[PDB]
Ligand binder design. Structure first.
Ligand SMILES: NC(=O)c1ccc[n+]([C@@H]2O[C@H](COP(=O)([O-])OP(=O)(O)OC[C@H]3O[C@@H](n4cnc5c(N)ncnc54)[C@H](O)[C@@H]3O)[C@@H](O)[C@H]2O)c1
Ligand SMILES: NC(=O)c1ccc[n+]([C@@H]2O[C@H](COP(=O)([O-])OP(=O)(O)OC[C@H]3O[C@@H](n4cnc5c(N)ncnc54)[C@H](O)[C@@H]3O)[C@@H](O)[C@H]2O)c1
Ligand SMILES: NC(=O)c1ccc[n+]([C@@H]2O[C@H](COP(=O)([O-])OP(=O)(O)OC[C@H]3O[C@@H](n4cnc5c(N)ncnc54)[C@H](O)[C@@H]3O)[C@@H](O)[C@H]2O)c1
Ligand SMILES: NC(=O)c1ccc[n+]([C@@H]2O[C@H](COP(=O)([O-])OP(=O)(O)OC[C@H]3O[C@@H](n4cnc5c(N)ncnc54)[C@H](O)[C@@H]3O)[C@@H](O)[C@H]2O)c1
Ligand SMILES: O=C(O)c1ccccc1-n1cccn1
Ligand SMILES: O=C(O)c1ccccc1-n1cccn1
Ligand SMILES: O=C(O)c1ccccc1-n1cccn1
Ligand SMILES: O=C(O)c1ccccc1-n1cccn1
Lengths: 267, 267, 267, 267
């Protein structure tokens, strides 16, 4: 197994279409022993994660809750056993209020909403690294989920800005993590039909936003030299596992694109 | 004059070493008629701006104050005369609490402080564009000040993250501004010895941060193929005026580097 | 005039739709005194350049001819007068044999053809700088024409590779030019309907290449927040003149995008 | 084994310090069955590769020899057996005549020398893909070696330009390879003390070039958040094997940085 004997924390599962659900499944297939973290709806998340190949302890983590973060390392150590540390951490957490994601004009998102989205989607990558680096082994790996924000796109709006901030945060987390012998990287995924994504395409944020997001997805498969299947998160999950493994040992502060190559082509 | 007959709003003057002070001076030398905006210490700012080549009306603008922003367009129109619109807007506004800029470890900045810095340094670029685009002429130009955040650097810490967000915001502001026939761009400047910058080098945020920032400045002149003079903001001001002029008419959503070429060389 | 009193060499005119024809026209409108260089069909080029606002001396320059390059500085000095130097140089020269530009598969271009295209389109930027820097004034400016090659695109094929090389060459030319107080930059233009470009769209290199290039142009105007008019080279010419002027004095080794902002947006 | 049962062609071994020697060793440790290609000194290369963990057939390949390239697929098939195809191809080939690499000024490299270096270091990536894609399995992987050329650096000179071209070539090879279900990527390595590299630092190309290259290496370990050991090619070899494996299945046309994270930090 690619991750045999590694202890890895995976955040971000909320449904069986969450990217983190597939990260967790593949990591377990590859021999990793997991600790899961979930936000708010913990009975739902437990029921969802009962479908994973192996049972995993589930800890509550609201990344906006300073007490959750202050206690997190102790609760993880309780879950994996004293004297054991983590080898990997997966941040698969993102949120932007509807006002920031195309339900209204870009200029009409109040800063209170934007700042909540940046807190959850970008600052919390540093928050989780601060909490967990003290219980991570040398040679460990922190991975977060990205959506390439180097160019503006319709509808994604302030979530794009949040991903721009996240990419910058990752480069600073790498500086801190390196003192522990730990790498920090993001995986920039192509679009994936999660429940939230499918709802947007179905018009949950208005018809214009849904039409714009559907056009975004279609251009992706067209541009990608190997194609892109938005209904299949497994290639993204495998890429996360590659970064969690020992096989990218000189990559840190960086971004790996699991997008079919779409960002390398113009059309 | 490069800007003859243009009406241009310039924010961001606080001392005679502010980058915006030199933007304002050069723009006036080039025939522009200015409206200035200032934050908090308006009697100080009036005294400072009395040294500009020409008298300019001074309006109060705290970019975190929604009432200041809601009234801004009406106060500008009162200053330049009914029936007149703006041709240019300069955003030269930046702030990050000391906790986010190296006085303590990167992980120790509370999010309340980071979010204040992102509000002032990044979100407010969209706020000012929202307020002023309705009173801007076609062919107009919005320019903001940037510091290249594509790579992490010591001490700048969360201000770097804020500039990453600002660059993303600029690309979305360009989408909105284009509907008015207006361009939006940033100028990424090399380091400039403002009063705040000199205080940091002198140790205002701790000795380690001061030493790191001094090393940053020295490498800049070394890398720049034409050199870099941190005591001279005039080349930065001229570049801002180039973007305010009609001579970069097909550039928008973009970043112009006024850094001596330092970002194009490794050593 | 933006370029009043400046002496500027402009290469690359072959028809009245050449980008260099419009660079020359705008520069002369702005007070510059020009020296033109032309390749191969010098009687045609003289007839074309008779339509410029002012008469300009025309010198022969085949950038693959080492004797043309060795004599160039002396012939320029003869044209502008002993004791006078150049303030600006415009490289607007590009060529790739048909085998490298979509008339056949990418893999079927022989290296002899690719190397000719790289010689003319990329190496010659260094060749011209080597020949002309000894007769350039401090504060001078060298500008070359670019087409953003950061992502692959259909049909452009090995010309894209040549532009990737040119961008790298420009960063090294900036190092050399800086010793003379001279800047070196490229302007990355959106697509322009030159005679050669119109012929390709009309099928001169095969129907597939023409269809692919037409689709490229259409996406450009769609993406550009201020639009893109492929029939109007004047915004590109003005941007070149901005770099030739004194108003971007701290930019070198760099690329300015005169593309309507299209490269900053995904869709 | 990460590469168990995969058939992989590895070019570029010339000494036991070649990056390709360590790629080959790690791939064999991970279960791959290799075919090696060597240039010019085939008895030397056979003696060198006798030290690999397993015997591998050695084929002659001068990438400037069209007959070598035309016969290559047939000779590989003869080596691995009819009915078998390749799963991986490693391009670890680079050369620039001394005139292009700092023994003289950048402007003094004749184009004949530059074009030879671009032929071997960039065009040949397309040449090898053209020859070998017809005998590659779906799900296969082509990997080439890169040195980040996004910024100019002293002494590397025209080799940097060649790497800029190679990166562009890789994006087009990905388009072609995708039709076969094959990925194409580069690994951008930090500096490695090969025999050629050590000779340059020792002054083989002049004292100035040696001093500049030594300063380049030292800044790399300083910038890298996890450090950089120029005497250890194993992290680079492991990264190549990661791209040859099935664990980066949605990455193509791309660049993976095995440089300690140095390119993500300014200082
Ligand atoms: N779906 C895509 O197209 C796509 C593409 C690239 C990247 N991503 C990124 O992948 C990550 C996972 O998103 P997803 O697509 O799987 O959607 P998802 O809705 O399945 O997962 C989002 C997760 O964020 C978590 N979260 C929200 N607020 C939280 C908080 N205060 N504390 C802790 N967790 C919180 C949710 O509980 C949920 O588990 C996100 O960073 C997303 O931006 C998604
Ligand atoms: N000094 C450098 O080295 C450098 C380099 C690149 C970019 N920049 C950028 O240039 C911009 C101007 O900064 P500066 O270097 O001239 O320093 P400065 O201290 O002279 O100017 C900062 C300005 O921000 C304004 N400001 C702060 N909070 C505000 C608020 N709530 N509302 C309105 N205005 C507010 C200050 O009043 C002040 O006028 C900033 O965006 C800065 O990040 C500076
Ligand atoms: N047309 C576009 O869409 C576009 C977009 C971006 C950049 N560009 C670039 O702008 C430059 C000018 O091209 P253009 O579009 O105006 O086409 P053009 O055909 O009008 O100009 C090409 C010029 O290259 C010159 N040239 C060719 N071989 C030469 C040689 N051996 N020595 C000297 N000169 C030689 C031609 O004589 C001709 O004057 C080129 O670098 C081109 O790549 C064009
Ligand atoms: N050493 C570094 O610091 C470093 C860093 C990043 C990338 N790289 C790249 O890694 C690759 C391998 O280089 P290396 O550092 O291991 O040095 P090396 O000298 O050990 O390998 C170079 C290889 O190129 C081959 N070669 C030269 N001409 C050839 C031809 N006409 N046909 C076929 N092969 C030919 C040589 O025979 C030799 O095997 C190169 O692309 C190099 O640019 C090296
Ligand atoms: O999850 C994401 O970051 C994401 C990425 C690409 C497209 C849409 C996205 N969604 C954001 C909310 C719901 N979907
Ligand atoms: O003004 C800036 O953004 C800035 C840019 C570069 C270096 C230091 C900076 N400072 C931030 C506060 C005081 N200086
Ligand atoms: O001139 C160019 O470089 C160019 C740029 C964009 C599209 C087509 C181009 N053409 C190349 C030959 C004829 N047109
Ligand atoms: O191999 C390379 O491409 C390389 C990369 C970085 C530094 C030096 C290099 N050398 C080139 C010739 C000898 N070394």
């Amino acid at each position: 197994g690619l991750l045999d004997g590694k202890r890895i924390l995976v955040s971000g599962i909320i449904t069986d279409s969450s990217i983190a659900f597939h990260i967790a499944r593949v990591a377990q297939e590859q021999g990793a022993q997991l600790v899961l973290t979930g936000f708010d709806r913990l009975r739902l998340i437990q029921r969802i994660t009962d479908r994973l190949p192996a049972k995993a302890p589930l800890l509550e983590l609201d990344v906006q809750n300073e007490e959750h973060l202050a206690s997190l390392a102790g609760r993880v150590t309780e879950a994996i056993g004293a004297g054991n540390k983590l080898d990997g951490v997966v941040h698969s957490i993102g949120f932007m209020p509807q006002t920031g994601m195309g339900i209204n004009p870009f200029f009409d998102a109040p800063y209170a909403d934007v700042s909540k989205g940046i807190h959850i989607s970008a600052y919390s990558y540093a928050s989780m690294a601060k909490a967990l680096l003290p219980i991570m082994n040398p040679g460990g790996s922190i991975v977060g989920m990205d959506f390439d924000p180097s160019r503006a796109m319709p509808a994604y709006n302030w979530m794009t800005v949040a991903k721009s901030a996240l990419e910058s945060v990752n480069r600073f987390v790498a500086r801190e993590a390196g003192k522990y012998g730990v790498r920090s990287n993001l995986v920039a995924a192509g679009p994936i039909r999660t429940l939230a994504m499918s709802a947007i395409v179905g018009g949950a944020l208005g018809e214009e936003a849904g039409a714009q997001i559907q056009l975004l997805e279609e251009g992706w498969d067209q541009r990608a030299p190997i194609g892109w299947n938005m209904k299949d998160a497994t290639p993204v999950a495998k890429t996360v596992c590659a970064l969690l493994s020992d096989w990218l040992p000189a990559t840190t502060g960086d971004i790996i694109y699991a997008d079919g190559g779409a960002h390398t082509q113009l059309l």
